[PDB]
Amino acid sequence: MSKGEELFTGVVPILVELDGDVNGHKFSVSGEGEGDATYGKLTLKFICTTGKLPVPWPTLVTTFVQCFARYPDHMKQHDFFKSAMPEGYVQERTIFFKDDGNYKTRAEVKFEGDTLVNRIELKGIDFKEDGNILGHKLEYNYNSHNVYIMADKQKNGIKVNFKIRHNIEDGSVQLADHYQQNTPIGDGPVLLPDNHYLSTQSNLSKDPNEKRDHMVLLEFVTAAGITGSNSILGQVGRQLALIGDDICRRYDTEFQNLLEQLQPTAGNAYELFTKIASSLFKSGISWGRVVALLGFGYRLALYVYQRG
Amino acid sequence: MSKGEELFTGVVPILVELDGDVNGHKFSVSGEGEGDATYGKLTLKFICTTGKLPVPWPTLVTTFVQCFARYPDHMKQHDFFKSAMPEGYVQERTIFFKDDGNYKTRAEVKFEGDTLVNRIELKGIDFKEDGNILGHKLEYNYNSHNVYIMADKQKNGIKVNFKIRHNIEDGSVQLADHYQQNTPIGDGPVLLPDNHYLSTQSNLSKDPNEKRDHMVLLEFVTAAGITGSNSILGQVGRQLALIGDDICRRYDTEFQNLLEQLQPTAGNAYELFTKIASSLFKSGISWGRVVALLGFGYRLALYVYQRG
Amino acid sequence: MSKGEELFTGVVPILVELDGDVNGHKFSVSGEGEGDATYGKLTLKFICTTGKLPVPWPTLVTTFVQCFARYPDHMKQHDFFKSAMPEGYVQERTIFFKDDGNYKTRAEVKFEGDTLVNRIELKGIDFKEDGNILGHKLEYNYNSHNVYIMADKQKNGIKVNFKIRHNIEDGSVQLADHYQQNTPIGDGPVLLPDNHYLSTQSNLSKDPNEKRDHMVLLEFVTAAGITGSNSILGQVGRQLALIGDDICRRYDTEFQNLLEQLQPTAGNAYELFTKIASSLFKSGISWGRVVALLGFGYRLALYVYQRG
Amino acid sequence: MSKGEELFTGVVPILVELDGDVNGHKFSVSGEGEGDATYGKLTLKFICTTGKLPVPWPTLVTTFVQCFARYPDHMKQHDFFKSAMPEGYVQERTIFFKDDGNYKTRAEVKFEGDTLVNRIELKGIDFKEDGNILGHKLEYNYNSHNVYIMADKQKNGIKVNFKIRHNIEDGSVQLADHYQQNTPIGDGPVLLPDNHYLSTQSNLSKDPNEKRDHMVLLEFVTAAGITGSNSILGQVGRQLALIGDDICRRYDTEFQNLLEQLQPTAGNAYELFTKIASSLFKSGISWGRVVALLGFGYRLALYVYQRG
């Protein structure tokens, strides 16, 4: 359970910015939205500030914050992203479009204010004029994918792998082989995970109003590929839990038999209890007794408080 | 109902022996019979193995096994006698006759395998010849009496008060002021009482056949002094102690199972603690969990303080 | 708050017995009933076992257990009667009928079993043949009266005074000047009161069925004549009480503002609380904080437990 | 909002003095200006009272009053700076330049009646002449930065981490790795924080008129790092601490009033206690009583342990 975990508890705002060059066409882009790591939901609008954009959008969807993925509790000691926070992390990539060129990305994903920021620097090269890319042949959508995460301790960081599928107007498909590295800027302790992955599912819409080359992006991102946890710590929660999910229902209706048979009111309550007390303990002591006793008091209090 | 109680369901036999000294005349007496605590009944013959008994019989009736009282059903937890068994108890008293002397008695009421026994050491001092005692002036009866008991938790024992009236040939009466104390010798979970009392009624006969100086003796003896309030509560007070060792048993054996997993240090104890905690509750709450939880901080505080 | 107090908590059964002689006419009487000191109520039937009774009944109503009077809490350290218990007390009287003879009474009012007993011995003398008494001139009823109690330490007991009014068939009235003494049989500690009194009110009925000279008696008996108590101990209960009868209503609707604004459920409860905890205490500590905290938890628990 | 906080509602003046040694060249510098924490604003001129300043100005910008940050409204309880005032605090740090030397600094930020002051003692050691520092190679800017704070409760102080980037004429960059610690000197109820951070943005100008080696310096500085969860709880966490000293005050002065009535002994303490208790509750119960009650067992445990 990381400290940096604790930022993303609610919604968190987000700004993103990028300076691109691909085969010399330069450009820049800026975007805004919110993300809720708790529901593993993320919402964003992007606009190109050099006006028209030389590449089709989805190419960048990746490039454009895995801090916002939902890790459930058994897995929460594997959330690297949030641990590196607030000081953040550097995310470098190399994205190989198959049969075409490539992207190099470097980015700092860090907190500035109560805001989170992705500052990205991009260089594409060797693409082809009629390539899928420069021919704006890619459809406007995104498939789901899996992002495979494995710890790299030589770097006090992680390595990440996957491949991206951009459907084509044809019915053909284009592959983007994603190779990635995330290295904390902070010198603090981070969380290094066991191998696991993330399940991104995605949708690309547009803003009816907005007139500029833009993209509106939604991502759901959920963490998985582990079941036991640090197994017997969080598995303490199997038996301490049904110890109680049975203990409650064991005795609580002869408990109520005693309250329907002692009909206590606030006047007598104290005396009632205290008498049961010293007298019950004159028997002997263990905790085995000591518990039961106040089990009665919570259940007692409830009978008085409700009755009145 | 301590085991050592569940012994008296039916009849049980008895022997008694005593060695007196009173104003220098010594003697001994021994006797035999049975008693049934189920009905609070007792039966004995006493024959003086020194032949002539220098003191009137009724004086000794007291000295001469209170385990044999009927403890009624609601009171079963105030029987100190049926608890010290089978290991038994040492009963000693001091007896002040009005305008006359005293007896100090020491004795052990202990159990032997089947038969229950009283060996008694009595020390008389300072009586008057035309006095009631040495004159065999008190008549051959016994009255009813009440016997008042209070826990002395300081001794893991008990303390007792009563005072007895020996009618006299005079038509007068004589007092014997009795102060008594019991110190259970078996070291066990003896039962220590709330304040209460017992009521003797009694009779002295003789056997036509037997020619030795003797006495044949019967007692009905019953416990009381708990009326409705104290009953209906203090019954809740044991009925809770019952579920209190149902619990005590069933669980603290999956406990060591995990303490033997960590290896507490008193150092890391403070954290390891707050941690197994929050994860377990993330489930949900009622007390059924809450009890279970610190039954462990107790079986843990005992495993760090004992190992080390 | 006496130990012997604790017998009378519920209803307690009662037997009464008497051996009379007045001007030589001898008689005896026996009776049964219950009494509840808690409501200060007492109920009894009496029958004459020598058949017809030489005196009119009400003469005895007094003679025939002040243990059964209700002392309220401020006065409860003045209940002498119940303190002397279980060993009980001896009640002697002398009752002077004015212009007529007198009664002497001695009685032992003590516990035998779970039963309370009044054993009474009576001697009347010097009455007149046509006196109100032997002429059975007294009406059948009882007025209310006051019984004035003053402590007598020379006797580790009390002295008691009052005067009794037996209306007459005439419209005339007959006076019975009551002088009384109550001395514990027990050697224990008793409660010695400040001067105070008891307020008896009484009714004399008959049993339609029962054919023997009898009387059926009801007495309500309540204690009074004191207001402060041991004043500043039980007066602690003025300010510790409105400290709370205001404290409750001070903050409990912004408390509820926080629960209607935290909408807690059993899942999150623990986490919720614990966070408020260390963070609230990082401020500083006193108890002044420490209280408030769990004031929230009782009020929290109630919001979860009820909701669900 | 500690008093020592309620000081900064408006503008406040400032003086600064420093005495450096770096690779044996020493110097001193002193400066003047104002700052307003209400808007998180700060303004200063620095003039080198040794004339020529041997190190580039930006190096010192850091060393050169964090009380002047805007702590936003929800965060008011994490301001360690505005708490140590007026008595002030000692801030010392150590600064590691990459591939170059260090500065150790000691200083006291203390308040004098109206003006706030920094006297600084700086110790430089081991730098390189063609190095960035001694070569006045770093350009005349400053970047934005984030500053990360954690409570060190062990010092009743705090500990701090950040790292700063001085752009260089090269186009390169140089790091200055800052580690800092504050030990409040006034011994008081200082406020110790949850983990959080602050964000500087800054500018370096010069004055045309002034001919001494100088620097004119402005900082916007704001606190953040608490998002919704931790806010909405930890606001409950102070808002409870508020009612927690409403309470703390109002009452523990009728307390001594009664401890001064009894004369506890540690001996009779155990009973006197259980007793004032039951009588008070006989009234009725809710917690409003319960709190009040043991606020006393604490102000009592302190009156028996202190008197004796």
Numbering used by the authors:
A (entry chain A), B (entry chain B), C (entry chain A), D (entry chain B): 1 to 64, 68 to 232, 1066 to 1144
Quote the original article.
Among them, the multi-domain proapoptotic Bcl-2 proteins such as Bax (Bcl-2-associated X protein) and Bak (Bcl-2 antagonist/killer) are the gateway to mitochondrial dysfunction and cell death. Upon activation, Bax and Bak oligomerize and permeabilize the mitochondrial outer membrane by forming large pores1415161718192021. Various biochemical and biophysical studies have shown that Bax and Bak form homodimers first and they further oligomerize to form pores915232425262728.
A fusion protein in which a hexahistidine-tagged dimerizable green fluorescent protein is fused to mouse Bak helices α2-α5 (designated as His-GFP-Bak) was expressed. In this structure, two GFP molecules were bridged by the mouse BGH, which in turn formed a tetramer around a two-fold symmetry axis (C2-axis). The BGH unit was formed by two anti-parallel α2-α3 extended helices in the upper layer and the two α4-α5 helical hairpins symmetrically arranged in the lower layer. The backbone atom root-mean-square deviations (RMSD) values calculated between the mouse BGH and the human Bax and Bak BGH were 1.57 Å and 5.01, respectively, indicating that the mouse Bak BGH is similar to that of human Bak. The X-ray crystal structure of the mouse BGHs determined here has the characteristic binding pocket formed by helices α2-α5, to which the BH3 domain in the extended α2-α3 helix of its symmetry-related partner is bound. Thus, the ‘α3/α5 interface’ was implicated neither in the GFP-Bak tetramer nor in the crystal contacts.
